[PDB]
Chains A and B, each alone.
Chain A
Amino acid sequence: KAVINGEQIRSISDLHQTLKKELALPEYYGENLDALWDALTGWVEYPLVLEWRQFEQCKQLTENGCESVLQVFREAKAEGADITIILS
């Protein structure tokens, strides 16, 4: 079970570092969309539940990339990874 407290996310790099800790990603985790795909399909433990709270605050960040991160989770689920996504 992994929680992203969107109110506390200050940048896309912060988002990747939080995912790294919450999902126990490898120390070498590349903090990019290709690294995230690889970790979600060939590293993480299942069943995986990601609760992303206040995704809307990520959208307010100057950097783009919030929807792209969510999209990788959704594509990994579509690929067959046992992932559940909660947008709260």
Chain B
Amino acid sequence: VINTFDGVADYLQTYHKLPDNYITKSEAQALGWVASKGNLCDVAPGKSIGGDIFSNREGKLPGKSGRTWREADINYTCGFRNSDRILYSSDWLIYKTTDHYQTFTKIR
């Protein structure tokens, strides 16, 4: 899998899509994902949650009306989800958080 900050960032910049080991929340739910049971790998082995719209609700990432942000989980290897996320824009800015969206740092 490609699931590290630099792994996913490099892949996004090169291919303009997430690696194959990502699925969205709704796609996971359709397969039987129940977040409170930590069961993503039971219904989608080797997968991580990622690709959903990121609404940037605290306005910490740079925003403008023509730019969409998305997010994906980083360092996930089954079980309950962690605090690590990559954030990527439609114009290919890439940021990270390791503290559950409290702070963000630009990485590309």
Contact = CB atoms under 8 A, between A and B. Distances in A.
Mostly, the B contact residues are loop
Contacts, number: 52
B63 to A, nearest CB: 13
A32 B7 CA distance: 27
Nearest to A36: B57
A37 to B, nearest CB: 6
Interface string A31-52: 1111101100111111000000
Interface string B24-65: 011001000001100000000000010000111110000000
- Where chain A touches its partner, the secondary structure class is loop
Contacts of B35: 41-44
B82 A28 contact: yes
B41 to A, nearest CB: 14
B81 A29 contact: no
Contacts of A44: 35-36
Given A32-B58, A33-B58, A72-B57, A43 B100 contact: no
Interface in A1-53: 26, 28-35, 37-38, 41-46
B92 interface: no
Nearest first, the 8 A-B pairs at minimum CB distance are A30-B100, A45-B36, A34-B101, A33-B57, A28-B83, A30-B102, A35-B100, A30-B101
B66 to A, nearest CB: 21
A33 B58 CA distance: 6
A45 B18 CA distance: 28
